């Protein structure tokens, strides 16, 4: 059933855990930044290797992984 | 066969209450939006096919799945 | 009531989870209501079969089960 | 056996510190009250036999068990 | 033995569990006090035997054990 | 011999991200400070040798190990 594949793709999109959004407060190392998590506290976290630290700047909104709170993406 | 039923059953399990009420901050993709959850923090979540992206303007109230925060519905304004 | 029965009643009453108090924002479906929880967030929840959907209206204080947030009881009002 | 003592012992264990401090909003039943927890939200909780319900009244400060918020004591 | 001991003492220090700081609201018993935790809510807690309850006055800051919130020190 | 090397790695594992950001409320000892965590509560924590106690004054933002809240760094 072709219907099943369509339903399964929709379920897959719905089942992926979400990314937490935060705001860059300051870059402190070449691969580390302080982010103010929308969850409330602030953290010093790593920036993943597929994110270019040059694209980060105070006030930039970023996506963090629910484990190490690593920055894994930058929002527009 | 039973596959169609298991999928439909799993799809409905993701949209029955309890759902978290949230607010659309902004669309990011055709099917991704950042939502300010009334639980406090903001998240980048997927927009389910049960929702028409056009109805997702910043400020719009939406229903989020308790486990993934995927947008499963928009609230009656 | 026997003393051991009183004691088991008391233990049961002290061990059951508390109910969260919230305020009905609006009913949005047959047994579905949006509730603003006193804990902060708002949820769209089911209404227990044992609660009378008609006793829910905007502003009504309700009790939510902790695990499912289901409305399982309604608080009395003035008069 | 010691069922009676075992039960009294379990009840005692539930009124030992730390206890959360709350404020009574209103009594709604024989031994049920709504208390606004200092932790933030309001809850409908049971009033233990340790407490004389007559000593409960809106505004009254009370001690709540840390796990179920049952009212186990009244403060001066 | 001398260089290794400096590293071990440092590690020992960094691993001792932290204490929660709160403020005394009021003494309730001989060794019971209500403290407003910086964590948010107010609690009724025990006062450890090595702490002189006489040093506990409303407004005084105290250190609380993480699990029981027992007062284990009164900040000067 | 290389026990030192193993100790050094354990010290370093305590200051790798994610670290919690906090603010020094006041210094209590030469190596202890009360810090207000960005997570809410205030804690009495130890200051690691990775940090110069002279740089810890009320208002300074610091990085706290997520398990012990020990101060492992200061933010410029």
Curated annotation (Swiss-Prot), chains A, D, E, F:
It comes from the Archaea. It is found in: Cytoplasm. Transmembrane segments: none annotated. Consists of three main regions, an N-terminal coiled-coil domain that may assist in substrate recognition, an interdomain involved in PAN hexamerization, and a C-terminal ATPase domain of the AAA type. ATPase which is responsible for recognizing, binding, unfolding and translocation of substrate proteins into the archaeal 20S proteasome core particle. Is essential for opening the gate of the 20S proteasome via an interaction with its C-terminus, thereby allowing substrate entry and access to the site of proteolysis. Thus, the C-termini of the proteasomal ATPase function like a 'key in a lock' to induce gate opening and therefore regulate proteolysis. Homohexamer. The hexameric complex has a two-ring architecture resembling a top hat that caps the 20S proteasome core at one or both ends. Alone, can form a complex composed of two stacked hexameric rings in vitro. Upon ATP-binding, the C-terminus of PAN interacts with the alpha-rings of the proteasome core by binding to the intersubunit pockets. Belongs to the AAA ATPase family. This is Proteasome-activating nucleotidase. The chain holds residues 74 to 149 of 430 of the full protein.
